[PDB]
């Protein structure tokens with residue numbers, strides 16, 4: 001809508017206060033004019049009709065319980081935009097400043113969130129498995145990263161390619177969470193999963209086997225469930241990424257960590273320049289080695305650590 005750019009204030013899903021970019025035209029709308037072609041957040045009103053109504057608020061204060069998922073969807077879309085722009089010189093998910101549109105209060109008791117090809121969609125959870133899913137910055141950025149992948153490599157969502165697709169979204173979801181300094185960690189979805197249980201998450205990148213997920217290629221799932229193990233086998237790549245950044249010794253292989261920024265640069269270059277729709281784990285290794293070579297040189301520590309990390313998780 002047309003109006004005046006304003007800054008409102010509200011509280012997110014976890015009760016934290018934050019400022020949000022809004023637009024004033026009689027009402028204050030969750031329309032951020034400061035990022036690309038805009039960030040727009042919508043009320044789906046517990047329906048499954050999308051996108052719903054552009055979020056309108058009478059006073060630019062967003063402290064109602066019903067407001068909280070919208071505050072976080074809007075704010076964390078903005079943080080994700082800022083990450084890709086400031087760290088990777090990428091303008092929105094398509095690199096062409098596409099508007100980022102999000103709908104909250106999707107359906108009733110809905111324990112999921114997803115990028116649907118044109119917008120983000122967030123359930124509120126059932127209050128036991130999940131609280132509203134936009135409360136997790138890593139969830140928001142994980143799903144928006146699926147759009148990045150779709151607009152670059154086009155990784156197929158099945159089998160090893162699909163596990164790479166998932167792991168890329170976990171890697172950049174995590175890197176966004178660190179970029180924001182929003183209680184960062186190497187676990188996924190901890191801020192919105194099981195409010196009655198502290199210390200858990202959907203999966204761990206630093207220790208996938210904490211939740212039973214494989215941390216080595218020899219332990220990969222080979223059946224047909226979960227589209228051929230896309231959220232299961234992602235642990236193999238997630239652990240390699242963790243090792244590249246943080247270092248460690250894994251199945252006896254010592255990895256010299258090179259930090260988060262270099263992890264992100266290596267994997268962003270691999271994703272955008274080298275991966276293809278059917279890349280497998282071995283091809284991802286090659287893409288990451290080539291990317292680190294492009295950036296740091298073939299004789300660099302960075303290249304040596306990429307190789308170490310993929311050796312540690314059994315990916316040749």
Ligand SMILES: [Ca+2]
Pocket residue numbers: 057058059060061062063
């Ligand atoms: Ca209000």
Ligand SMILES: [Ca+2]
Pocket residue numbers: 138174177184185186187188189190
């Ligand atoms: Ca996390």
Ligand SMILES: [Ca+2]
Pocket residue numbers: 190192193194195196197198199200201
């Ligand atoms: Ca929990």
Ligand SMILES: [Cl-]
Pocket residue numbers: 206207248
């Ligand atoms: Cl460990």
Ligand SMILES: [Cl-]
Pocket residue numbers: 206207208209215250
């Ligand atoms: Cl381990």
Ligand SMILES: [Cl-]
Pocket residue numbers: 247248249250
């Ligand atoms: Cl480790």
Ligand SMILES: [Cl-]
Pocket residue numbers: 249250251252
């Ligand atoms: Cl180990």
Ligand SMILES: [Cl-]
Pocket residue numbers: 289307
């Ligand atoms: Cl190699």
Ligand SMILES: [Zn+2]
Pocket residue numbers: 113114115143
């Ligand atoms: Zn998803």
Ligand SMILES: [Zn+2]
Pocket residue numbers: 142143146165166169
């Ligand atoms: Zn995903």
Ligand SMILES: [Zn+2]
Pocket residue numbers: 177182183184185190191
């Ligand atoms: Zn966290």
Ligand SMILES: [Zn+2]
Pocket residue numbers: 202203211
């Ligand atoms: Zn699990």
Ligand SMILES: [Zn+2]
Pocket residue numbers: 202203211212213231232
């Ligand atoms: Zn798992």
Ligand SMILES: [Zn+2]
Pocket residue numbers: 226230231
């Ligand atoms: Zn799954």
Ligand SMILES: [Zn+2]
Pocket residue numbers: 231
């Ligand atoms: Zn998923």
Ligand SMILES: [Zn+2]
Pocket residue numbers: 249250251
């Ligand atoms: Zn280990």
